[PDB]
Amino acid sequence: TPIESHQVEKRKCNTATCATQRLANFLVHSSNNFGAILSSTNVGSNTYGKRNAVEVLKREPLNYLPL
């Protein structure tokens, strides 16, 4: 196959790809806020108990046994 040309034509940040990388940087930058906010989940948003995943698992052993 022929070598790719060195022609480039960038464009304004209109594609979701641009934001995709923008939010990624903000994530590691807002870590403190994330932990601090989640820590106060007791405010009422504590209905995300991940430990429940294991509770239901044992409750439904079928998922483990052949279907």
Swiss-Prot record:
GO molecular function, one term: receptor ligand activity
Cystine pairings recorded for this chain: C13-C18
PTM description: Amyloid fibrils are degraded by insulin-degrading enzyme IDE.
An annotated GO BP: amylin receptor 2 signaling pathway
Primary site of residence: secreted
Superkingdom field: Eukaryota
One GO cellular component, as annotated: neuronal cell body
Tyrosine amide found at: Y48
Keywords: Amidation, Amyloid, Cleavage on pair of basic residues, Disulfide bond, Hormone, Secreted, Signal
Subunit structure: Can form homodimers. Interacts with IDE and INS. Interaction with INS inhibits homodimerization and fibril formation.
Similarity field: Belongs to the calcitonin family.
Cited function: Amylin/IAPP is a glucoregulatory peptide hormone that plays an important role in the regulation of energy homeostasis. Selectively inhibits insulin-stimulated glucose utilization and glycogen deposition in muscle, while not affecting adipocyte glucose metabolism. IAPP function is mediated by the CALCR-RAMPs (AMYRs) receptor complexes. Amylin can also bind CALCR receptor in the absence of RAMPs, although it is more selective for AMYRs.
Misc remark: IAPP is the peptide subunit of amyloid found in pancreatic islets of type 2 diabetic patients and in insulinomas.
Protein name as catalogued: Islet amyloid polypeptide
Organism classification: Eukaryota, Metazoa, Chordata, Craniata, Vertebrata
